[model samples]
Target: MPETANIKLGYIPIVEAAPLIIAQEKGFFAKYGMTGVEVSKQANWASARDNVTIGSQGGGIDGGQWQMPMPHLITEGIITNGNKVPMYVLAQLITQGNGIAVAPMHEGKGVNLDITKAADYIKGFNKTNGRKFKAAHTFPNVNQDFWIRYWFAAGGVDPDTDIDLLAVPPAETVQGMRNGTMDAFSTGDPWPYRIVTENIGYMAGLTAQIWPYHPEEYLAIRADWVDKNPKATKALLKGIMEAQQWIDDPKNRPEVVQIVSGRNYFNVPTTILESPFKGQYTMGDGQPAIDDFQKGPLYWKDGIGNVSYPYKSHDLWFLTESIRWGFHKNAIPDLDTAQKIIDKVNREDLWREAATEAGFTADIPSSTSRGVETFFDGITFDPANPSAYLQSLAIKKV
Candidate 1:
C-alpha cells in the first residue's frame, strides 16, 4: 500500500542471507507493502556480482547480500569488468557467522586464532616438502580472505609470501580438503559446520573470535533502482528490519533454521544448521568450544551496537584492509580515495530514515563511525586515522 511492491534481490545460500529469506517467508515483506519481492538464489559470490551488474531489468538483480566493500567495489567498477554499476549499501545483514577451517591433517599444528605456534611449520612447509601451505577463501580481498590473512599475520606468518592463497568456491574447498590439496578455508556458516560434521576439517578460528561482532554481509541495491523508487526502497528496508528483529529472538531460531533449510534454500539438514544458531560450536583440535548466542549469526544487535545499521566506519575498515593487502590497486589507491568511495556508496542516511519510518529511531546510531575496533590479537583500528593502523601491521603490502 505504500509503494510499488516489486523488487528483485539476489542472495547466496548461507546463514548470512537469512534476513532476506525470512522477510519473504514470514509475511514481513507483505506487512510492509513489498508483496512482490523476489529473493533469487545465486550460484556463488561471482554470480551475485555478475547479476547485480546487468540489474533486474536486464535479467539480473537490483542487489542483495554482499561481502564488505563489494558495493563500494561495484560502484567504482573495480570488479565488474570495468563497467561501473553504482550501488548503495542499505543495511548490514548479519554479523559473526564465519570461520577459518583447517584440514584434519593439520589439527594440533597451532593453526588458530593465534598461529604463532604453527608459524614455523607453515612457513617451512615449502622448503621441506617442496610445496607451500595452501589456503583459500570463497572470494578474494573480502571478509573471509581478510580473516585468514589477519589470523596468519597476527601469529607472525605472512599470508602472502609464506603460503599459497587462492579464491575458491566452497564446494571446491570441501573437495580440496578431502583430497589433501587444500590446507585451510576461510568461509561462512553452514559451510564451516559441514566441514566439522563431515570430518573434512576442524575449525581453526571463528571470525567472531578474530573480530567479535564484525560486519559480515549487507543488503545493497542499484542506485538507479533506489532513485527510481525511493518509497519502495524504504518499504523494503522496513520489512527487512522487522525480519531482523524477529530473528534475534531465541524462541524464533528453530523456525529461522527450518525456513532457510528448505530444498529451494540452503537444502542442508536442519541439524547441521541448528548448533551455530544455538551458539554451540564443537571446535575440534582440543580447543575450548564456544557456547554463546553472541558468537552466532546475529542480525539485530551485537555486543557493542546495532547490527543492521550500515556503519560507514565498517566500510572504511574494509577499504583500508584492501589497501593493507593491495587489492583493487587501481580503485582504492589510498585512504582518502577509500573514504570518497564510502561516501558515494554507503547510504546510512537512508537507513536512518527507514528505521525512523519503521519506528526504530531508538536503534539509530548517533555517528556513522563505530569508533575503534579491536581484534583478537589486541590490534586496534581507529577510524580517525587508518594509516596509523596500517603502520602497526607487521605484514602488509602497504
Candidate 2:
C-alpha cells in the first residue's frame, strides 16, 4: 500500500470537472497509490489561481476548465496584473465546447451571421439605438473574453468603444440575459444551453466554428508542486485519463450524466446535464434547437490520441490572442520561446506516462505544431507569426 499524504486539488463546481470527480469517487486515485486527495470547490477562476499561487487550497485539482489563453496570461503576468507565478498544465479538460448566445432582441437581425459581421451589426445597433450593448464573459483572461472580443473585432465592432463587456459568474449568465442586464454572453456548456432553453437568446455561433477543435479548458497545477511530487502527478494524470476514456465512450454517457449531476458538482437535473452532450439545445423560448455539438471535450481522437492533451498550436493561438488584446502588456520577445514554454507547461511527458498506465498505447506526436487559419468566415489566425495576425485586425493594444 502506498503511504497516504495530504494532496489537495481545487476546482469550481462546473461540469468540466467531471473527470476529477469520477477519478476520486471510482477509486482511480487510490488504485494508483494516491491517498487523502481532497477536491475542493472554488468560487471562481481568480480564487482558483490565487489558491494555487498562494498555497492556500493545496493546489488546483482542475482549476475550473480555463480558456486556452489563460496559462499565457499567468506565465506572462498579463491577466493577473503582473502577479508572476509559475504554473504547469497537467492536461486538457475539454475542447471547443463553448458558444456565443445573443439576446432575443438581436435575433434574425443578421447581426449574428458571422463573428466579424456580427461585430459590425452590433456597432450599428449601438449607434442607431444609442444603447450600449452589454456583454458578459466568465473571465477577462479566458476564452470567453477572447472569443467574444475576437468575433466582435472581426465584425468591425471595437470591444472597448462599442460595448460594455463585464465579467459575470457563469451561473448568472442566463439570468443576466433574461433580466435584460446583458445583450449577450460567451460561455461554455450548460449556460448557453440554459439560455436557449429559457428563450432569452438564440445560439449565435460556436467556438468550434470560429476555430475548430480549439483548446478550451485545462487541468493546471503549480509547477513547483508538480516537480516535487512527480510520481504522484503521473498517477493523478493516469486516473483522470481513465476517466476521460470512460467519458468519451458513447455507451457510458448515461452514467456520465448521472455522475456529473450530483449535488457536489453541477447540481443540475440529469436532463439539463445531458442536453448539451446529446446536442439537444433550447433557445430559452418555446423553440427547440439541435446541432451536432462537437465531442472534443471527452477525448481528442486526433493529434495526441486518447490523452486529450492540449495541442501546441492551440496554445500559440491563445498566446497570440492575449498579445493582440493587450492582456499581456510586456510582449514575449520570442515566439519560439513562448511555444516551448507552452509545451513544457502542457506536460506531454506526464500525460503520456498517465495514458500508458491507464492501459492504452496512444502514440503522441513528436511535434504538435499546427498552421493557424481563420475558420469563421473571413477571420484568420496565424500562430507562427502572431504580430502579423494582430496587425491585420482592427484592435487597440493597451
Candidate 3:
C-alpha cells in the first residue's frame, strides 16, 4: 500500500535509539518487506528537527526518532510558521535513560539532593550573595527542559524565577560543567556518564528516580506519508516492534551496546553505553574504588513496560505542564482544539494494529489511559482532567 525505496529515519546517537538501529541491523525491516536499513545520524536535535520538518512529501526521510513533545511542538510552532506539515508520534522507543547532574561547587553538600528537597537546596543557593543557580538543558520544551523544571518544581523551587535556565548542547554538558558556568544539567545519556566520569558533577538523581518508567523517545512520522502508504507504514511499524522484541531479550543487550557503540553510532566506548544499560552509576564525588550504583532496572520491554502503553494522557500531561510554564505562551487558547490536534497526532490505533500484526496483541494496552500517574512531588496527573493538575501547582507560568 505504502511505497518507498528506502525508509530513511533520522536519529541521534543515544542508547535510546537502539530500537531503530536494531530494526535496521537485525533485518526485521527486511523480514516485513519494508526498506530495511537507512538512517541519518545527526549532530544535534535542531538538525533532526530540521530534517524531519522536511515533511514526507518533500523527499525527506519517512520519519525520525525524536523526543516525545517534538511532533506537538512541530505542529504548534514549525507548521504554524507556514510550512504546513502535520506530524504524529507513531510509537515510543525507550524510557528513563536520562538523569540530572549537579556540579560539585554548590550547596548540595548537606541537603537532600532528593527530588522532593532539591528545590529547597536551589532556593538557598539562589538567595545568598549573587548566587543564582544556573542549569543547562539541551533544548527548550523538550524532555530535558521539562525534567529540569519538573525536578526543580518538585522541590518547591519556581523554575521560571528561581534559576537562570540555559540551553547547552548535550556534547557540551560535561565541558559546561567543568567550566563552572552551569551547576546542573538534566538530559539523556551518555552525558550523565560523561559528567560523573570526569568528576565534574554528582548525581542529583536519575530522571527515572524522579518519575519512574516515564516514556522517553518517540518514533515520529509525517501523517500524510501514513495516509498515502498504509501498508508500508504498518510494515515499518511492525519491523520496529519486532526489533523491540529482539532487544527485549536481556541476552541481546551486550551485543546491542556493542552494535550501538561502533564509530557510526554513539561512538563512545561500549563500556559507557553498557553502563547505562546495566543501570551502573558512579556518583560525582569520585569513586574509583567504588562499583557502579544499581540505578535500578531499565524499564522497557517489548512495549510492555510499567504503564508503557502509548496513552493520550501522556500527551495531555506533556502539553499541559509545558503550557503551565508559559512554554506554550497562550498559543493554546482553546483546550478542545489542542486536544483534537493531539488526538490526531497520536495514532494509537496504528500502534495496536501493528502490535497485533507483530503477534503482540497480548502486549497491547487495553486502554489509552495509564490511570493516574504521579511524580515525586506527590501530584497525580489523571487523563480525565489535566487542567485540574495544572491548577494544583504552586508555581506556574500561566
Candidate 4:
C-alpha cells in the first residue's frame, strides 16, 4: 500500500473517538505506515461532519468521524436542506454509548424504572406532580428521540401525548434534570454516568439494553475521497479497526480508562471512567452494583459486526421511525429503495476492504438487514411492515 503521508483526519472530543485517540497515542497509525495522518478535534458532531465534508471536498482533511445516522439523513435530504454529500464508513468507532436517564421525581415511575408499568406510573405521577411529564432528546430527528419514543410507545405510552418531548444537547441532560427544567433526557455518555455520580438522576435504561448490538458511532469519509484515495482510506480504516480491537480486550481496559480520562479527552475523573468499565454502577438511590455493562467499541465478537458500515435493516428502522413521527410526510413507498440509498451512503465495500487488509475476517451475515427485535423487552420490529407493528401497539400515534 502507498503511504498516507498526506492524510488529515478530523474528529470530535467524544468517547466514540477513543479509537482515533488510541491509534494516535499507541503509535498504531505509525505501525500501519500512516505517517502523515493528523487527528483534529472539532467543536461538535455537526461541525465534525461538516468539516470532514468540506475539508475532504476542498483537499484539506482526508476524512473524519461522524454519528452513524447524520450522514445517511443528509444523503436522504431529510435534514440540512438536501445538501447531499456522499460519504463512506471507514470503520466502527464505538457502539451502545447512550442511555435514557430520568430526574429524581420520576425515578421510580419513568419509562426506564419499570418499562412494563411505565404508562400507569407516569400517569399517576403527572396527576400528583400537577404537570404533564416532559422528556428531552439530543436532536429532534436523531436516534435518541427515536429509541426513547420507541421504548415509550412499546410500553403503551403515547410519546406525543403522555409526555412533552423537548430537544436539548447531550451535555445539558444532567443539568436539565437537576434544575427541574426537564423530567428526563436521553443522551450519550459520559453524561448519564456523570448524572448518576452527581446524585441528580439515575440511568433508567441504555440504548444497549433497549436494543443490544445497537449501532452507535462511525468513522466516515467522503465517497469521492474514498474513490480517489482508496489506499489512504484503507489505511485509515485499518488504524481504527486495530484500535477498536485493542480497546475491546479486557486486559487493555485499565490503560484505556486512564487515557480516556486524560485532560484532553473526556476530561472527567478516573472514577467516572472506572464506573462504566469495571461495571460498577452507582444509581441515584444509594445503590451500587457491578453492572455488567456491554462490551461495545467491539470490532468482532460472537459474529457481531463492525460499527461503521451501515446495516440496511438498521437504516430502515430509522426511516420508519422518522415517518412514524411525521419527520417525513409520505410513508416510505419502497423499503428496498430506501435501503439501497442507505447502503450507497454507508459505503460498506470500502470498510470490507479495510477490514481484510487489517487481517480481520469479514464475515457479515447475508441478512445484514434485521427486523426491530428489541433487546430491551423482546418486542420484535418489522420495518417492512411497520403498520402492523404500529397497529398492534395500544399507544396513541399522531
- Output the number of the TM-score-best candidate: 1
Which window of 10 residues has the lowest lDDT sum in candidate 1? 105-114
The reply for model 1, stretches above 4 Å from the true place, is none
Each model's TM-score?
0.98, 0.87, 0.91, 0.86
Provide backbone clash counts, one per model: 0, 13, 1, 2
Output the worst ten-in-a-row residue range by lDDT, candidate 2. Answer: 298-307
Q: Return the top candidate by lDDT.
A: 1
Residues 31-59, candidate 4: write the lDDT tens digits.
77777677876766566655655664474
Give the Cα error of residue 281 in candidate 4, in Å: 2.5
Q: With candidate 4 superimposed using the best TM-score fit, by how many Å does residue 167's alpha carbon deviate from the native?
A: 2.0
C-alpha lDDT of candidate 1 relative to the true structure: 0.91
The residue-by-residue lDDT of candidate 3 on 1-398, one tens digit each, is 34764567888888678888888887888888876448768778777777777753465566778876888877666424646567778877777778778888854453223445455666767566366888888777788888888878766777778788888786576677788767888866776777767778777777766776776778888777778777888888888777776775668888888888888777778776667766676655443222332342342452234233467877877778767787666566545756886887888888888888778877888788777877776788887987888888888876
In Å, residue 167's CA in model 1 sits off its true spot by: 1.1
Q: Which candidate model has the greater lDDT, 1 or 4?
A: 1
Error of 4 at 134 (Å): 2.2
- For model 2, the superposed segments whose C-alpha errors exceed 4 Å read 1-5, 56-65, 75-83, 113-120, 283-288, 293-296, 300-307, 331-337, 340-344, 357-359, 370-374, 378-382, 391-398
Candidate 4: segments with Cα more than 4 A from true spot: 2-4, 56-63, 110-113, 121-130, 284-290, 293-299, 302-310, 330-334, 362-367, 370-372, 382-398
